[PDB]
Amino acid sequence: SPTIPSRLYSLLFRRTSTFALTIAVGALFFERAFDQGADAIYEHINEGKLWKHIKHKYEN
Amino acid sequence: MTNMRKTHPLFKIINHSFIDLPAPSNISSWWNFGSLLGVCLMVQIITGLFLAMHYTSDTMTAFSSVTHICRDVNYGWLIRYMHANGASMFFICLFLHVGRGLYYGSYTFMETWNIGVLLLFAVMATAFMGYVLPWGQMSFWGATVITNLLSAIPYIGTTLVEWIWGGFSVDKATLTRFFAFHFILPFIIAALAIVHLLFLHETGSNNPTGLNSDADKIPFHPYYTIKDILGILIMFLILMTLVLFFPDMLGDPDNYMPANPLNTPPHIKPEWYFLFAYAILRSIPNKLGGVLALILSILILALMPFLHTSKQRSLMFRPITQILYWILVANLLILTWIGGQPVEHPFIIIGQLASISYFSIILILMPISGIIEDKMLKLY
Amino acid sequence: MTNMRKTHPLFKIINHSFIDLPAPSNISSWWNFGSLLGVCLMVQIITGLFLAMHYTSDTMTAFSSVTHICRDVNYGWLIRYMHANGASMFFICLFLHVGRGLYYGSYTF
Amino acid sequence: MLSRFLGPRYRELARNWIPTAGMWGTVGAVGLVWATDWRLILDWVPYINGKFK
Amino acid sequence: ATFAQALQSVPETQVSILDNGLRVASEQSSHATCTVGVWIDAGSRYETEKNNGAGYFLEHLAFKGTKNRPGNALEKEVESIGAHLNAYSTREHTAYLIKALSKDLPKVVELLADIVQNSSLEDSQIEKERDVILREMQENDASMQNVVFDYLHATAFQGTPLAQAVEGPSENVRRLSRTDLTDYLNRHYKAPRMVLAAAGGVEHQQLLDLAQKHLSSVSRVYEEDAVPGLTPCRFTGSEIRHRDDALPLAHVAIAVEGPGWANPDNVTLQVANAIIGHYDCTYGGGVHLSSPLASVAVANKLCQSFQTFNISYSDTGLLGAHFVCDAMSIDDMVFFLQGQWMRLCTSATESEVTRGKNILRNALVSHLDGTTPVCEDIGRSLLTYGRRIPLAEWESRIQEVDAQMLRDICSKYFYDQCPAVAGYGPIEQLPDYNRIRSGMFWLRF
Amino acid sequence: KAVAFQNSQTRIIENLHDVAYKNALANPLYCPDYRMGKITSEELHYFVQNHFTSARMALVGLGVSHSVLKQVAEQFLNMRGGLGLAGAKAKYRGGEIREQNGDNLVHAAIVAESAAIGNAEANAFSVLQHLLGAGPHIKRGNNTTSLLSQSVAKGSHQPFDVSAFNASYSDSGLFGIYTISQAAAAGEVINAAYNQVKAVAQGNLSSADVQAAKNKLKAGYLMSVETSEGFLSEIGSQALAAGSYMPPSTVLQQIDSVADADVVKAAKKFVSGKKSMAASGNLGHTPFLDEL
Amino acid sequence: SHTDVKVPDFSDYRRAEVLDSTKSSKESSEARKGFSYLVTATTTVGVAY
């Protein structure tokens, strides 16, 4: 069985256009995943202090 | 010893571009005009800088600051009307420069021509935002009309227009960002003009005969130095007789009223050098059609080097295409006259025929005429 | 023939200044700093241009326009504080660039 | 457009370079919908549906 | 009288095997002369860096006296019949070949049986040939393409026996003894690695009878049963540069790893080389040459010469280009050369492939002309492939190549590969390895 | 011309022909330096119109039938005139050119007039060439049967190379000795080779050496006609020189018809003939023609 | 002599999968290129974000 970077080079990293397509698709999924992770980390650090954690007591 | 002019790395470029540059000996006064444009650019920048030390880009105070410049700053009226009539002189010299390039076949220098049409677009945008800047009645309504017709682009046009406005209409943010952009674009124009000079200096200048002038070239200094100085003096004579004697013959009186969003003027115009394009913009009863008509009416100069079908570069020995060229200048003047007229009979049909004739002469009639002229000389 | 990077008159200037320019192999990180200065200059210009899109040079409204940038313009506080701290970063890079020139004998140019 | 580039060799060159051109067009389309955050495209990709874009 | 049945009309190479295992192969023609050679599967790849000059020094010593023909007698009855005696050593093969008349065919064979079997290695002759080899390496130092190809092997096959030269270093030449030469002979001159090849006016049954009478009962047994093996050689993407600005011209070789002898892709790669071709300053074609590299080298006055090579060893090789040019053109030449490679990886059309196929067909048929290159091809064919590949098989393998598999093979062996670079002379404008490695792929593809 | 003159023996052969002939064989194969930049198109047209005529051409084909070759011959090669210009018979002068250029090796060639193509004596001269050494037969050999190498090698401890030079043209001949030696020992090498040829000219030779020289000549001819290029060059040369195709068996028969007394006569003709010398290198110790 | 030169040992710098000179390349070149280009691609993704 080949190594995972060997498969990535054989499929995606060989041609420059496929390299750019992989970069763009990874940019979308990386943006979404990092936005989720960073928002979760910041909200976990600031539990009970943000407006979105206390707005249910005033929505009536 | 060492010749300092040809060895010092700052003086070497100045030498190669202005002193020991081999220029054609037979270029007429029309070749002065581009240098005049550079001088006009510097003049505009200098006058613009001395307008910027007292102008305020606030909608409450812009008209008040302009009147304060005209009435309380020492010789501030002089600098303001020099700036306005120097913009008009810039467009006069620009139109004659483009006409020289069209007549003498100078568009075969393709990179120089394309950097030129980029410079022309930048100068038109700079003059438009500068005319918006005094915040008169005419400035506000001209900006409103131009952006409202720019909103004709499908699916992005309203978003793009509200992004340019920074709001629902032409407001304080529009005036402040127009001040910033009008300040910053002439330096980009100066850099693009440096690129323009470099792309010309790879190959030398054209001559009115259109032939290879390598056998007869002279140094730029002192011949074209003193010729450009004389042209600068004549252009300054026309500029100062425009400023000191008829300071409002080219402007609009309604720009001396403050900007009223509630009051609309009975007839809305841009300043005169836009007017022909405005006529083309209203020669089609479709908003997208008029917008693309304006864009291709400016970009047809960029399309021009691919339409040259003659074996002779210049029009000095080509009388039929000379006749077609002067008919083109004629209906360009006609479109300039129509653009300042209101939209009734017979201005609508005259402007439609003038736009059709303009596009048909540039697109169709000149290459066919060049083919016929090649057939007459037993070349085709 | 097709070596456009060294035949195109615009592209040969960028080539001769940034691609085929012979540079010493052993220059340390101090030689980075001047390039940083140019980039920092660009940053200042860009931030200043956006700061010029909402600032009024009137004594009754200059402070008000600065507060309006910092409060009401979307990420206007970011642009203003990048401009101020980029001025500070520009002077840091100037001091280190001048110190490199003093230390390594570069003033003989 | 011109008679210089008409023939079998130029057709073979176009057939050689057409999947690369299509892949670059796909790269440009994905980059455009990524930079502009085009909702009509991005509200069909399953993972980024929670971004409301 | 078509090309296919003309290649069918070529006589078949007839191969037999003796009792000790040495191959005997012959091809018959109507020529009155003949070429009879002995090919031994031995070279500098089989040496272990203590006897690195051994095969070279033995081929120097082979014609200077044997046990039954001492001293200069072997010269006297090789040239009393007008025969010509030649020998050469590559990194993998050794050849001793005689050009003679057909009627002198028996004696020539036993002369070969006197050379590879009963050589007498006299010590004063060892000293004389040691001095001769030292000054002959001094002569070879001033030929820049030999230096560049040795540098290319040394930087492409680092840490392996394929890096070292056939001649070896000068210190080994100074300290090789007679015992090491006898050990080299008794290790590598074995019967199952020997082919007696003959071409021209040779009767195969007569040649087989003479090989049975003269070449039998030799070797076939390792005395300590220490059977050697041929380990694979690692290719290393690297660069060597020997800068010396006093030389008038600069020689640069750039290569990638080849596939080896047994891979059929060599044929396709040969067609690729035929698309790029060669050029020298005395070529009469000028600007109208079909090769784009040669045409742009004429038009821009870039190179003194260039050539393309596909050197193959046992499952390895060097596939690349060598050019000599002045300093101020070097980088520009590299640029155009790399462009041609990427064109063959991306935009190979059928017209240039057909031209390369015709060039390769003409090249191999023109090379197989005369008794000496036919016998040379027979010896290499039985040493490498184990058989003599007929010329119709070569034509079929050429004609099965089209533009699609040429693009595939060129992309597999060329695109995004780390090359080996060797440079000698005014090579200051020779670009960096990073720039060359970036030029080995295209961002537009 | 620069690539051809990169090696010294080309210039030696050019200078030797210029020494040996007054005209019509002393014209150089390569263009002179002053004539570069001056050869015009009408000179080429004049040369082609006066020398590329039908009676001086032979069309030779290997791998084609006679019908195709003769029909392209009647469709192309019928528009030319005749025998063209005659020539100038290539009269002999002799002399010496010494080109001092400070090389590490001295190249010298001493030649005399010999028989032309078609004379039987020229065949004897060929045998005499293989009596004296016309090239090595072993890669890195000692040239044991070469008489010149045996005569020079006993008195030389430094590298040398001596051979016999033979050049037969349609009206003339040039047989001589080529020597390459060190600068300090050129005189003894040249004198030893000349004394070897003088000893051959006095009837001091073995019949076994004549038989070995004949075998060398026959093997050289049969190896020269071995390839298709050499075969077609031989056919074209025979068709131009004699107008007929001579079989190789007949060539070997007239080689075997040569007597050893003819070899003695050829060596005596070289010895008694007027000499022509072309030398190059550091010629401080290279002897002159009267000093031999 | 030009045959006297030898490339020195680079085994302190070489990767583990190219450290042995008796084994071939091209069954590990794609892995090394994939690792380096994965580093480059992840850098490009971060810069693009």
Ligand code: HEM
């Ligand atoms: C960087 C240099 C420039 C600066 C700083 C500048 C600045 C200004 C300022 C402050 C005004 C408002 C004052 C007024 O009402 O006249 C103005 C007006 C104007 N500017 Fe500029 N300007 C510059 C260059 C130019 C150029 C190159 C043009 C020509 C394309 C131009 C065309 C105009 C026009 C048409 C007006 C309107 C004048 C009027 O009120 O009638 N400016 N400029």
Ligand code: HEM
């Ligand atoms: C921003 C305003 C412009 C400036 C400052 C400018 C500057 C110059 C200068 C200094 C020259 C050399 C002197 C001369 O031949 O007149 C020149 C020539 C030229 N310019 Fe411009 N230019 C401008 C606009 C344009 C435009 C809009 C075009 C395109 C239509 C253009 C096309 C050319 C051409 C083709 C020449 C060559 C003249 C010839 O050899 O015939 N320029 N320009």
Ligand code: HEM
């Ligand atoms: C042409 C480009 C530039 C423009 C248009 C520009 C414009 C402005 C504007 C409008 C302000 C006021 C807004 C504010 O207070 O933050 C400002 C502040 C400032 N600028 Fe610039 N600027 C430019 C370049 C620079 C440069 C190159 C520097 C020096 C590194 C610089 C240093 C500063 C400083 C120190 C402040 C004060 C920051 C503060 O206290 O808030 N600017 N600039």
